[PDB]
Every structure is written in C-alpha cells, then in structure tokens.
Write an enzyme that holds these catalytic residues in place. Structure first.
Site, PDB file in Angstrom:
ATOM      1  N   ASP A   1       0.815  -1.215   0.000  1.00 34.16           N
ATOM      2  CA  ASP A   1       0.000   0.000   0.000  1.00 34.16           C
ATOM      3  C   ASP A   1       0.855   1.276   0.000  1.00 34.16           C
ATOM      4  OD1 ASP A   1      -2.186   1.733   0.131  1.00 34.16           O
ATOM      5  OD2 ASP A   1      -2.660   1.436   2.200  1.00 34.16           O
TER       6      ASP A   1
ATOM      7  N   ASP B   1      -1.620   5.639  -5.230  1.00 29.10           N
ATOM      8  CA  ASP B   1      -1.981   4.696  -4.162  1.00 29.10           C
ATOM      9  C   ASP B   1      -2.224   3.278  -4.697  1.00 29.10           C
ATOM     10  OD1 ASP B   1      -2.911   3.302  -1.962  1.00 29.10           O
ATOM     11  OD2 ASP B   1      -4.771   4.355  -1.721  1.00 29.10           O
TER      12      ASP B   1
HETATM   13  N1  LIG Z   1      -5.263   2.011   2.918  1.00 35.71           N
HETATM   14  C1  LIG Z   1      -6.101   0.828   3.236  1.00 35.71           C
HETATM   15  C2  LIG Z   1      -6.193  -0.151   2.052  1.00 35.71           C
HETATM   16  C3  LIG Z   1      -7.193  -1.245   2.350  1.00 35.71           C
HETATM   17  C4  LIG Z   1      -8.244  -1.521   1.466  1.00 35.71           C
HETATM   18  C5  LIG Z   1      -9.167  -2.532   1.752  1.00 35.71           C
HETATM   19  C6  LIG Z   1      -9.022  -3.268   2.930  1.00 35.71           C
HETATM   20  O1  LIG Z   1      -9.918  -4.267   3.233  1.00 35.71           O
HETATM   21  C7  LIG Z   1      -7.975  -3.004   3.817  1.00 35.71           C
HETATM   22  C8  LIG Z   1      -7.066  -1.992   3.519  1.00 35.71           C
END
Ligand SMILES: NCCc1ccc(O)cc1
Length: 370
Positions: free
Chosen positions: A37, A221
């Site tokens: 991420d 992102d």
């Molecule tokens: N920045 C969070 C990114 C994220 C997206 C979906 C999830 O279930 C968990 C994290």
C-alpha cells in the site's frame, strides 16, 4: 542496478483485492502475505486467529520481539483496525537479502479490514512518516530499511492486472518497461502527492481550472483499485465520457451503484475513449502525459464495474492507472517515474502511453494550498 531477477514476479493478488508480497517477521521466521500500500505508512499484521485469516503473527514464538507498550487505533469510514505496537526482525524472501528491525502493529481487533477469501494477513504502508499512526515518530518500514542497510532509497512497482506483478526494492528493472521513464515531482512527502495539470478525454481537454484536478490532493496509491476523481472533476469527467460513449447504459452504473454486463468477448472497448492525464514535469513549464485505456477503467468482476469514482480526499491514481505503467517511487530524488509497462493489457488498436515533453504554463497554480 538495472536488473533484479530475484524480485521479478514477487507480487500476487486477486482482482479488486489488492497486491500482496511475501514477508517474514520474527525469529524463527514466520511467513506472511502482506498487502502493498503506497497510500499508508503503517506495517500492520493480523496477530490473532480471526476467521478470515490463513495465518497470523504469533509474537510469543519470536525471540526477537520487543514490546513498545503502546496501542494504535486506525479508523475508516467503514470499519477499522486496532493493535499493539512492537518491533521485530523483518525480511522479504523475494526481496533484498537483508534483515531489519522494524515497527510492527500487531492487529488484535478489526472491522471490515480483512477480506473473506483473500490470501493476505497484513498491510505494508510504503508512504511517509507524516501520515503514520499514531504519529510521525513511528518510523515506517521503508525508512527503517534504508536507515539500517545499503538498500538505495527507492522502490518500483509493476502491477499486472489471478493477478501478478513485481515490487523492486532498492532499484529499477529495465525489462519491466519500454520506452523512457518520465518523472513528476513529489509535491510533499506524506502521501505520494503529485500534480495533475491537464486532463484529456479522447484527446479533448476538459477546460477546467486545473487547481481542482488536485482539489485537496492527488496521490499515487497501490491500495486503491479505482481511479478516483474529485467531486467537481468527476462530475465533468463522467459528463465527457458519457457523451464520448453515446454509441450504446443505466444511470447508476456511472456512480458505481450497479454493474453492467455483456456476452463473452462482445465487450465494446472502442465505444470508450482513451484518458490522458498530464502531470507536472521536472522542468519549469514542462509536463508529460500518461494515457490509459478502458481496459483500465472498466474492471471485470462479462460484468464490469466503472472504475472511476468521486472523492472528498482528492484524486487517487490506484490500480486502474498503475496497471498501465511501471511506476518508480524515487524517494531519494523526491519524484515519481512513469513508463509504459511491459505487461499492460491492450488491443490491436490502442496501447498505454507516456509522452513528452509538452509546454504547460502556470502548473504551480494547479497545486491546492491548505
Ligand atoms: N489504505 C487501506 C487499504 C485497504 C483496502 C481494503 C481493505 O480491506 C484493507 C485496507
């Protein structure tokens, strides 16, 4: 420097559920699959037997674990995650042959965070300390890595839209792209923030005050599936795409309120326009542009979800954008590089493109101030 065969194809995923890398934490090593991420800054991993998890961090089994005696709570619109902070030894098996002591948030309680049926158990925040929780004194993983080893301060991502890709830590692999890399300045080191200076639908400008293309902010992102556009921009973007594609659709589809379906191999790509984003360049009055296809913004779930959506946090260049390009997070020089990915999906008519230089004036005006 330009070749990292060990790291090629080190990413896995499922469509819509992000990309993950294999990591090990603690001694002896516990193997975990970790979501990559670039829109966050915490290394956080499941630490308890939540039903959705294949595996989780068992601190009691690690001799190198050190308690920080401090909690962290991360809310989301939806749910959240909450955990206990510590440090332990961290490696990336299909990464650089080093081991680092890193901060780790052991997740003890979460809501709508882990996905039922996914193969990942944690998250690797690759952005800067400024947006780390609970505050900027908690050193992110990548900072710790750079500080403790000889790994150069940059990484790159090739996301190939089940799904696969590469995360090259400490460098660039030239076999992962074609043509030239083009760089856009990191505006500020918190998210990977950049500036969009112009938007074209099918080679036609939106004629909007560019300050709003970045209304609030524009970021790269890898944790977001969609290309996300600020309310006002999304409004005008849809309107142009809508009129560009008046060749064949429900109203809710454009707001992500329902899906649209076609027969196998009857998907009309050509009734959809290409989308070009012009980004600020390295040189005063100089920009470049990246061009994505409907392959990118029409994501299969043949049923597809419109992968452009409105936002209150600004522009988000997620997997839609990133799957078209090799993306270089050049932290040492405060810039992000874009090149055509050697793996992006296309047809015989149109391919993804990175082109420059273009002359664009008043690019600084495009940057929204607090
Ligand atoms: N920045 C969070 C990114 C994220 C997206 C979906 C999830 O279930 C968990 C994290």
């Amino acid at each position: 420097r330009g070749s990292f065969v060990e790291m090629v194809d080190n990413l896995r995923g499922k469509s819509g559920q992000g990309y993950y890398v294999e990591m090990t934490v603690g001694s002896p090593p516990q193997t975990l699959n970790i979501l990559v991420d670039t829109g966050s800054s915490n290394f956080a991993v499941g630490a308890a037997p939540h039903p959705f998890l294949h595996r989780y961090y068992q601190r009691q089994l690690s001799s190198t674990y050190r308690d920080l005696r401090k909690g962290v709570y991360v809310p989301y619109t939806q749910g959240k995650w909450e955990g206990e902070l510590g440090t332990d030894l961290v490696s990336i098996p299909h990464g650089p042959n080093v081991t680092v002591r890193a901060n780790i948030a052991a997740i003890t309680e979460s809501d709508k965070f882990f996905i039922n049926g996914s193969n990942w158990e944690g998250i690797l925040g690759l952005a800067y300390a400024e947006i780390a929780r609970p505050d900027d004194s908690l050193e992110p993983f990548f900072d710790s890595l750079v500080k403790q080893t000889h790994v150069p301060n940059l990484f790159s991502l090739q996301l190939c839209g089940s799904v696969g890709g590469s995360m090259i830590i400490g460098g660039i692999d030239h076999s992962l792209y074609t043509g030239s890399l083009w760089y856009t300045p990191i505006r500020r080191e918190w998210y990977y923030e950049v500036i969009i200076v112009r938007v074209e639908i099918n080679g036609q400008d939106l004629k909007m005050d560019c300050k709003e293309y970045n209304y609030d902010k524009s970021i790269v992102d890898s944790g977001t599936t969609n290309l996300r556009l600020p309310k006002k921009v999304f409004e005008a973007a849809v309107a142009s795409i809508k009129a560009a594609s008046s060749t064949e659709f429900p109203d809710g589809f454009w707001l992500g309120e329902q899906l649209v379906c076609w027969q196998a191999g009857t998907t009309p790509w050509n009734i959809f326009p290409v989308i070009s984003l012009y980004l600020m360049g390295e040189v005063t009055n100089q920009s470049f542009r990246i061009t994505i296809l409907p392959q990118q913004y029409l994501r299969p779930v043949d049923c597809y979800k419109f992968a452009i959506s409105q936002s209150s946090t600004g522009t988000v260049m997620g997997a839609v954008i990133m799957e078209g390009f090799y993306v270089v997070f050049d932290r040492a020089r405060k810039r992000i590089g874009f090149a055509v990915s050697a793996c992006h999906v296309h047809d015989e008519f149109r391919t993804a493109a990175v082109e420059g230089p273009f002359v664009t004036l008043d690019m600084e005006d495009c940057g929204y101030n607090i």
